[PDB]
Amino acid sequence: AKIIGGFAVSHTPTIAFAHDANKYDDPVWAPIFQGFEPVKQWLAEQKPDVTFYVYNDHMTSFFEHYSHFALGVGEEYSPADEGGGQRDLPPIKGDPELAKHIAECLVADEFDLAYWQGMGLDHGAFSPLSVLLPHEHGWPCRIVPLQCGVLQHPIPKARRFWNFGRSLRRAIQSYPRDIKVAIAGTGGLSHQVHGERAGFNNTEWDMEFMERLANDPESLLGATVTDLAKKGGWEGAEVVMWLLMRGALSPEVKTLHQSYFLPSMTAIATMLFEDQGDAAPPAESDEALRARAKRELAGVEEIEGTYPFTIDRAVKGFRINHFLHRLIEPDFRKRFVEDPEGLFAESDLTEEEKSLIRNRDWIGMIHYGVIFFMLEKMAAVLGIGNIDVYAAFRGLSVPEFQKTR
Amino acid sequence: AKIIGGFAVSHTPTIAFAHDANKYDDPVWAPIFQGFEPVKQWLAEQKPDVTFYVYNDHMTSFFEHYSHFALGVGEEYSPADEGGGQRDLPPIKGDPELAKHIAECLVADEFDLAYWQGMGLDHGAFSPLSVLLPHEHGWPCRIVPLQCGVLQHPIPKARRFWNFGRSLRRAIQSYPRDIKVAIAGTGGLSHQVHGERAGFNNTEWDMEFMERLANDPESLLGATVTDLAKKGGWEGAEVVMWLLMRGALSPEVKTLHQSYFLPSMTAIATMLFEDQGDAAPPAESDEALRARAKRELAGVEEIEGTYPFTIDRAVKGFRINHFLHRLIEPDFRKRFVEDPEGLFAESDLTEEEKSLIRNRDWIGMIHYGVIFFMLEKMAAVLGIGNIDVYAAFRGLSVPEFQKTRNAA
Ligand SMILES: [Fe+2]
Ligand SMILES: [Fe+2]
C-alpha cells in the first residue's frame, strides 16, 4: 500500500536483442545500457514487492479479442512465443490479491476492465524487465501487468488513461497490506514502423513530452491521437501509457533520472520518478474506499449455497476450468470420452483436480472453483443431463429433485 | 439512425432445444412459443436493418481473456461449438460500420471497450434468435453483438450498464445512415444453476423487475450484485443486461407485450418495448456528437505514409492478419517455411492475399490492411531483418535507409 515511485522506459525488442546478444561492450549499446543503470540500481535498493506494469502487447496474446484495459490477475507469466520461440527467462510471479483489490476499486470508479491469465507476456514486458531486473535465478519482485489496447482505434482518450492512473493510485494505496509498489509505464518514445513514413522521429517533441510528463502532466490531457501521431510517429502515440503511470504518482514528483538515445527506429528513453507521498489527505479515506470497493458483494456470504466466481476463485480454478474449456474442441472432447487418463497424464491437473473430474463430483467441483458453465460442458459431453447435475448439487436423487420443481 | 424499440428475452439454450425438437405443439411449450409470437411478428413487421444484441457468453468464446463490454466488429458470426458441435444455422452478418461508429461514440463518452471478430456467437445469441427470426437461408437483419462479462466479478455496477445504454442511444441515433435499429437485452430472469441453492426461482421478484424495468427503470439503478442475487438467484443477476437495453430506449416506452413461463430451472420471460422517440432535443446534437466522436482522429489523413489501424481496416485485413498471427504457433510457422502452398490451400485466404504473402510485398500488405506487427512475425520467421521491411516501406535500398539512422 505504499507507492514508492515509477519508471518510464521504452519497450522495443531491440533492447532485448542487444541484451541477449551481449552488447554491453558495444560502442553504440554501451552508453544506452548505462542509461538504464540508475533505474536498475533504484529498483535494487528500494526493493519493491510488486511492480504494477503498464505495457501493450504487439498483436501476440491479444488479437481476435482486443481490450482497452486488460488486468493480469494470474499466478505467474512467462514469455510469449512471438514467432521466434520462447525467450529463455524464468516465469515472473503475479499478484492475484493485489489485482483483485485493484479491479474492485477500478470498477467502483466506473472503469471497464478485462481480466486475463495463462497467456504469455510479449516483449512489451520482458524486453525492459530483463534489462532492469536480475532474472538469472528468479525475478526479485511480483508483477501486476496491465495491457493497454493502444493499437486498434478507437482507443481511450489521453485523459481516460490519466484518470485510470488517478484511480489506480487510490486502489494501490488503499490495499490493506504493508507493501512497496512501483509503477512502470512502457512504450515510446517517437517512432513509426509502418508505411512510407517509417523511420520518423521527433527528438524535440520527445524532450518536451518528457518535461511535460514530469512537471505538468495535466497540460497533455487534451492531446488527440492525431496530435501525438503527427508529433511522435504513429506508434509513438502509445506514450499515453506513460500518462497512465504518471497519473498513479504524486502530483509533484522528483525526476531522479532521464536518458535518451536514438540509434535506430525508436527513441529509447528512460525516466525515474520518486513518489513524493500526499501533500493533503485524499478526497476519500482508504477505509471508505475499501468499503466502496466492497459495496457490490457486501453480505454475499449470507446467500447460502452460493459460490461467487470472483477473481480469487478464477485463479484457484484456472487449471481445471482451462482443461474443461477445451471440451469445445472436437478432438479434445473425443479423447476425453475415449481415453480420459491419457489426457490426464499430459495435463497440468493436480490429483484432486483429476479425481474431481473422475468421480463426476459436481458439488465438489463447484466448491473447488470450477465455474458451472464448464461443468455443463462436461455433463453434455458425457451424455449426463443437467438435471442429474442440479440434483447432486442439492444432494438429492433426481425424482426427489423433480418433485421440488 | 432510428431506434424503433427493444425486446427483452431469456436466452436459455432450453429455448433452442425445444425449437430444434419441434415442441411447438407440446402442452408445456405451446403457450411458451405463443409468448414469443408478438416479438416475432413485431420484428417481421418493423424490419430493423440491424439488431444491437446484448448477451453474455457462457465461458465459450470468452474465458482466458474476459472483458466487460466486448463489441463484435466483424463481418459475420457463426454458432460457437459449446462442446456439442456446431448448431446447423446460417451465419448472421455483422455491421462493422455501425459498430465502428458506436465504438467511437462510447469511447468519446469514456466507456472502456473490447473489440472482437471471428469467434463463435454462442446460445446467448442463437437460442432466442433462432426462435424469433426466420433463417432458412439467411437472417433478416444484421447484428451488432455486445457481449457483457457478467460472470467474473467484479462486473460493472448496474448504473454503469444503464449509463452504457444511455450513451448507446446517442451513438446509434447519431449514426449517419437512415436505417432502423432494434435493441435486444437477453438473459434472466430468476434462476440459479450452481451450488446447494441451485433451483432457486422468485416469480414475485421476476414480475416486479419486469414492471419496474418497463415503468421506473431508474428505481433499479442502485441495485448491488448481492441484492440482485438474493432476489433472483446468482445467475438471475445477469438482468443488468436488460438495464443496458432499457437505457438505450426512450425514457418512457410503450410495453407492447410481455410474457412469463417457468417450466423448469429458468423463468422464461419476454418483453417488447416500442420507442417513443425524443420529447426534448438531446443535450448534445447529432451533428456535434459526430464531431466529438471524430475528434481523436480528425486531421489524421494529413499525415502522409500512415495507415491508421481502425476498426474498418481490422475487419478488412482480418483473414490475413489471423493467418499471419498463427506464425506464433510452432507447427504452423514450420509449415509456412517448408510448405506454404499446402498451408494456403487449407486457408480461407483470397488469391490476392496469398499473392501478397508469396511476393513478400511489405508495403502492399500495409496498404491492404495487414498490421505491421503481423508482418514483423512473417519477416522474422523468414530470416528477413526488420530494416529490410522499413527500407521496402520507404522505397529505398537497405543502406540508403540505414543512412537515415544514427547507427546501423
Ligand atoms: Fe508498444
Ligand atoms: Fe446468460
Residue numbers in the entry:
A (entry chain B): 2 to 406
B (entry chain A): 2 to 409
What does the original paper state about this entry?
The three catecholic compounds are degraded by three evolutionarily related type II extradiol dioxygenases–DesB, LigAB, and DesZ–in S. sp. SYK-6. On the other hand, DesB exhibits not only a strict substrate specificity but also high enzyme activity for gallate. While LigAB is an α2β2-type tetramer, DesB is a β2-type homo-dimer. In this study, we analyzed the mechanism of the substrate recognition of DesB on the basis of the crystal structures of reaction intermediates.
The B-factors of the Fe (II) ions are comparable to those of ligand atoms; the averaged B-factor of the Fe (II) ions is 21.0 Å2 and that of the ligand atoms is 18.0 Å2, suggesting that most of the Fe (II) sites of DesB molecules in the crystal are occupied by Fe (II) ions. The R-site is the same as the Fe (II) site of the substrate-free form.
